[PDB]
Amino acid sequence: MDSEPPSEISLKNDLEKGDVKSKTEALKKVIIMILNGEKLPGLLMTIIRFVLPLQDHTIKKLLLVFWEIVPKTTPDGRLLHEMILVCDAYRKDLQHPNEFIRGSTLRFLCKLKEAELLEPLMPAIRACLEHRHSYVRRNAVLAIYTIYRNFEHLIPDAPELIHDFLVNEKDASCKRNAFMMLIHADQDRALDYLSTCIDQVQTFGDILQLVIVELIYKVCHANPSERARFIRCIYNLLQSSSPAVKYEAAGTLVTLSSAPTAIKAAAQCYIDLIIKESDNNVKLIVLDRLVELKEHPAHERVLQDLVMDILRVLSTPDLEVRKKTLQLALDLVSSRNVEELVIVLKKEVIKTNNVSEHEDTDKYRQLLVRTLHSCSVRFPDMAANVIPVLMEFLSDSNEAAAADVLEFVREAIQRFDNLRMLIVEKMLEVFHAIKSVKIYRGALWILGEYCSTKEDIQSVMTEVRRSLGEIPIVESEIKKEAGELKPEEEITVGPVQKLVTEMGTYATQSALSSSRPTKKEEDRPPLRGFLLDGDFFVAASLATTLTKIALRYVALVQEKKKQNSFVAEAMLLMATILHLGKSDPVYAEAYVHVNQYDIVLDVLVVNQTSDTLQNCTLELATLGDLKLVEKPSPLTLAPHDFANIKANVKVASTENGIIFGNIVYDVSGAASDRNCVVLSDIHIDIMDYIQPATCTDAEFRQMWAEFEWENKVTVNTNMTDLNDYLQHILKSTNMKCLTPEKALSGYCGFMAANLYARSIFGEDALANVSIEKPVHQGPDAAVTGHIRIRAKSQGMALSLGDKINLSQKKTSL
Amino acid sequence: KGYPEVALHFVKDEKTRFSLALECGNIEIALEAAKALDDKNCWEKLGEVALLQGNHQIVEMCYQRTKNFDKLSFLYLITGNLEKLRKMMKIAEIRKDMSGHYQNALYLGDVSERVRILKNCGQKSLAYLSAATHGLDEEAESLKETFDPEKETIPDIDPNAKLLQPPAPIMPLDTNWPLLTV
Amino acid sequence: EIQEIVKTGLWVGDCFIYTSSVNRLNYYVGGEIVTIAHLDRTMYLLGYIPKDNRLYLGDKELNIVSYSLLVSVLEYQTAVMRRDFSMADKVLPTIPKEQRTRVAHFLEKQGFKQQALTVSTDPEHRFELALQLGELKIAYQLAVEAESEQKWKQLAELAISKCQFSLAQECLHHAQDYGGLLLLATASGNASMVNKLAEGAERDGKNNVAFMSYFLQGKLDACLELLIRTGRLPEAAFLARTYLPSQVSRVVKLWRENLSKVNQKAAESLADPTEYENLFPGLKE
User: Fold this and answer.
1) Which of A304, A536, A693, B67 has an alpha carbon within 20 to 30 A of C194's alpha carbon?
2) How many CB atoms lie within 10 A of CB C42?
3) Number of helices followed by number of strands (H, E) in chain C
4) Cα–Cα distance between A150 and A156 in angstroms, integer?
5) Radius of gyration over alpha carbons of chain C, in Å?
């Protein structure tokens, strides 16, 4: 009988039957239905009658079982007395020669904090005063303590009965087996006795002595219990810069992340921390101790650095461990992050050296070039390293492989003015075999800026200019680029001037030069030719032309703040980006009142009628996410009764199977068809059910992408900013205004709120409230705001859309 | 009602009573509501409102039972009491509120109050400097002798220059701030 | 008796270089066990062949691995053991960064905090040695007057202990420590350098810190002002009455006005004695 709540009639029958097995099974079936929480008092006389005196342990044990989980509730066969049918003949049970029945009886009897059993539990310590097992003596210290807990904090429970009444706790210390139920409030002499016992311990018992009294002067003295306290005590005597090298903490710690890569990744972190405490700049974070595994002697054999190499990773162990490991290389050794990121990047970025680090997918290659290159932009020393490695990247000599390479290096030159003169000659080489945009773009920029340095350019450019591949974006990049630097410093059959001619043709003009350009018609609609066409005031010469622009870098460009940079090593970053970091007539009148922060729905129940409505009961219901914190409890609604009855309200619950409308309120009365009527007290909305939750800009952005929010409305009374009406109203449809999606200035400055919720509707809810408050001569519609809304199938989107207008209720009875 | 009218009529809730009191500005009723709200926070907030109506007797009582003996210590020369100011010093001594017990010695013309409190803190240096300057070099010396000596040292502050202040020239204090009340 | 167990060992002079079951290569000097280097794997000392300039180790393999013995470290530490602290300092130019701090810590353990201070690269180790020596001045330079407040708080306490109040007042200033700094400082009786370190306190609601600063020789230095700043306007009125330069009339007014704005109507205050509080003609000396 797993859980069957109607079966009590059969149990009575089964409980006495003249067959002992049946009786045991019955009583067992009662236990299992109560434990789940089901019907049990009908049976009581039957249950109690067979078992009572006997020394036959199994039925007695079963009855003994049922007296610690419901004795108080059941009363057919027990009623209320001092020597109840729980203990009257269980004084026999306590005083049987078999330890088990006595012991069991003692154990339940003393366990209860019952006051209708207080006297019978007190000399119940007799059953276990003699200690036939470790179990008997432990059973005794726990039972005396449980007696002490049960209203006997004074002389009824404190001395000895004949050996224990609160003194097993003392005795246990010096006896062969220990266990101290003495944790609080008990004899001082036993506490003292436990200390002595630390030495003459029994190990289970030591965990009991130890919860009470901890800290040792020793190293130990033995056993897991003492050992477990000991690592706590050690952390005290050296708190300083974490544990560093984990103590006896290490054993539990592995299981704490049994799923399976995460342990190594964690372990790797600690091992890296431990090596050294470095400068602790941007991603140079290694704490713990400065010297404890050093770094870097030149006589150390086979050195520290061997372990450091693991941390430099491509994936060399698996991805979770990889992400931890790349950060960890950066963390022990660099200048900041820059130094060790360049080494690390050199390995990752595409080459002709190894083909286990090159790939023909263009974005990844490109990104890897940008990561290597960002280190230079960060720190100078890296410029010198980067440029020759970049030329190796080029040497791959696939159209695309060159292409990616050329694209970053060209950015580097914008930063690094006439420093990378050397690269230009390498960069031209792979520009001729071509099937893509990227190669043309980049090459034309290097060869263009670099012209003073070289003289090749008609020849290199011209094979490509009459070759094909994909050429949209090529136009833009060649347009600003081709002439640049020194007015007449090249010549192969086209000097720098031919280049300016070319540069202009490629931009949007027409001219025979480099055997004509591939295309002329520019990239995306805004860019066009014209700016540059106007430009080249002084023909490709460092002055105030293309050259200027080329040998200068747009805004601030420093660090790895992503200003001509990309922020570490490209593969590690994907993982970091991913991390969102999300945090019968009846009359009612009613108002909601709050006194001393108690929120209640006031209801007055009125019988305007002369007719009888007796049988009157009042209930507030649990609909779904609405709940009663206590229904109105008066038996009112009688002939010409006016009553004030208070129903307390909650807003947060779990969905019930009954209707999901406004608030259900139920009054009952006389009638047999409609004994229960549902009638209303004032408004509560569907919107309550939504649950508020919040987003950060990353979670908002991810969800924006994840599912559409095209749906918009413009809501009146969003004249005001985010903070005022809009927040308060948004709150009531369990929403909250978080992070921005705005871009403010002297022409821009709609207020933008990123909203989130996680509705109990199987959807989230998100929105952006844009408040069109004029920051221009031509506003949208002046003050008002357009709320762009969604939910996960946009079923709550709509709630956001209208619950940001207005919202107010009041009455004054 | 911010000038209680409706408020006067229903006042049955200990909270409504509390509210009523700040809206008048007469916190005599507040303290009782605050009492019946069984809460300290109310006593300190009504005590502050009390200081606003002007009278510090009412403030003292409240502030004493919220246990803001140190706020009181601060208030008290400002108020011009010296007898009450001493009561605060002792019952803030025990708390080791060093910006409570500490205040009052300065505020009376002689500094002796600090000297003992600081002795109990174990702040022997601070106790000597305070005492010495008032010309209570003997007490200053006691502190040095009980503890580490060396009293000779001259800090960025004086260690022996006169401390004397004439405490509160007012004969009726500002615990006795006059009022009529409308 | 030495802490790290000797799995195998070798004598280089009277110094014992041994391997440990921790994979530590340590050397015994003085009855003290120092770690010369860390072994990454389990290694055994074949012998020290002067030719190679090396100690020859072997793994499980009947092949060679080599560790040169770190003689400069060993000689620094050995000299320290002998109680030839100066001698060990001659070695120091050829002890790097963190190693100078470590060798310094060796010097210190054996004794002489000061010689350890000169060799220790790390300023923090110098700073602590200076507290230990009781060299307040040296510890003071090491903190450095602008910031390093943690250094200064340790120094300030040390200065109060020695009852050298002077160094203490300066440490507390650099520390800032307004609450603590005031306690040492307001013992003045002339308020000589107590206003600065409580200027903030006035308007931070750290009024208490502020009142002690200003009222200390019968002067109202910024006593009143602290009270206005905080919004504890009643208290400024009250103070003004106390010392009667009859400034009370203005403070009571400003305050009374404040009652009318802060919802009092039955104690509204806008009168001279009618609506609770009392402007100066009600008041007196």
Assistant:
1) B67
2) 12
3) 14, 7
4) 10
5) 34
Q: Is the peptide bond before A321 cis (omega within 30 degrees of 0)?
A: no
Question: Which contacts (CB < 8 Å, 24+ apart) does range C221-228 have?
Answer: C221/C191, C221/C195, C222/C195, C223/B78, C224/C251, C226/C201, C226/C202, C227/B78, C228/C254
The two tokens of residue B23 are: 């809206």
Instruction: State the DSSP string of A448-510.
Output: HHTTTT---HHHHHHHHHTS-S--TTHHHHHHHHSS-SSSS---SSS-HHHHHHHHHHHHT--
Question: By 3-state DSSP, what share of chain B in percent is helix, strand and coil, each rounded to 5?
Answer: 55, 0, 45
- Structure letter (DSSP) for residue C94: G
Within 10 A of A82 (CB to CB), how many other CB atoms are there?
A: 12
Classify residue A103 by burial, with Cβ atoms within 10 Å: 0-12, 13-18, 19+.
Answer: buried
Which chain C residues are Cβ-neighbours of B102 within 8 angstroms? 183, 186, 212
Give me A228's structure tokens: 């477990």
Tell me, what DSSP letter sits at residue A725? Answer: I
Task: Report helix, strand or coil for A532.
Answer: helix
Distance of residue B78 Cα from the nearest chain C Cα, in angstroms: 4
Instruction: Specify the amino acid at residue C87.
Output: M
Residue in this structure with the two tokens 């914008």, named with its chain if needed: A414
Q: How many Å from the N-terminal Cα to the C-terminal Cα in chain A? A: 56
Residue C78 touches partner A, C-beta closer than 8 Å: no
Cα–Cα distances in angstroms (integers) from residue C16 to residues A553, B172, C26, C85, in the given order: 62, 86, 8, 21
* Residue that is written with structure tokens 């017990």 in the block: B101
Q: Which residue of A has its CA nearest to C41?
A: A302
Cα–Cα dist A740/A769, whole Å: 9
Pair A795, A687: CB distance under 8 Å: no
Whether C38 and A290 lie within 8 Å, measured CB to CB: no
CB contact under 8 A, C264 and B22: yes
Chain A with chain B: Cβ pairs closer than 8 A: 7
Question: Tokens 């004493």 map to which residue?
Answer: B64
Among the listed residues C43, C24, C44, the one whose alpha carbon sits nearest the alpha carbon of residue C35: C24
Kindly list the distances between the CA atom of residue C112 and the CA atoms of C115, C118, C123, in Å, as whole numbers in the listed order.
6, 11, 17
| C258–A contact, CB cutoff 8 A | no
Place of tokens 């408050």: A773
Can you name the residues that pair with B132 across neighbouring β-strands? none
From CA A91, how far away is CA A81, in angstroms rounded? 15
| Residue carrying the six token digits 């952390």 | A235
Helix, strand, coil fractions of chain A, as percent rounded to 5: 40, 10, 50
Resolution in A: 21.0
Determine how many CB atoms are found less than 10 A away from the CB of residue A532: 24
